[PDB]
């Protein structure tokens, strides 16, 4: 996925999957 954003350990920015 190119849209996903890592924002913390084991966590992505909301709805970026």
């Amino acid at each position, epitope marked *: 996925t*190119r*849209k*996903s*954003i*890592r*924002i*913390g*350990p084991g*966590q*992505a*920015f*909301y*709805a*970026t999957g």
Partner: antibody
Amino acid sequence: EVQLVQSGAEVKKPGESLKISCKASGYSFSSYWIAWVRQMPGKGLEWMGFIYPADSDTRYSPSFQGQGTISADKSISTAYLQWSSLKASDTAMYYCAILGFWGANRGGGGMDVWGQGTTVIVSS
Amino acid sequence: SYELTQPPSVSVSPGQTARITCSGDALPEKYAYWYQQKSGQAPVLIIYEDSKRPSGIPERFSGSRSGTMATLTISGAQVDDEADYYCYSTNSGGTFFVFGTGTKVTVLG
């Protein structure tokens, strides 16, 4: 060369509309979030919101919701920020920036490619 | 809404170590990022994911995060390191990014 080039300085009056632009080149425009950052004269950086050009997924910080519309036209690799009714308090430098372009910051939240900024003055 | 707090002013002499803190209640689970902004210039990313330097950024810049605080450290401060420094992170819900209030680092040259 990966690059974001912003439109030129603007001087407007309250109530007028304005659309400023951020032209991307040297990379796949659809695949990276583009953010807009406001900096009022002598103040700090404020994250307004960002857009993923592939599907135009657009998010705003709560205080910037409805205070400036972010959009993108991927056919000409350009992101935009616009107001239909400017206020004096919109006076600021505006930057656009790409998220996660370089190295291990790819897929991440660091804004690592920046436009040169657009100065906007709104005054009666 | 979510805010990241920074001291407004830090001063150092050349060769000394400057430390810049960033505090917020969502930091225990969210990465910190640091930006440097020199007078007249656009911001530059200097630290991402707490502690990682992009290439071209000098090793004298380091970062850490623990609990509600993230810290940017500038070892052996140089005159050209004088700038505004902004931390940056998301709210706990991961629905927006915010900048810290900014710290002016003065290097007494």
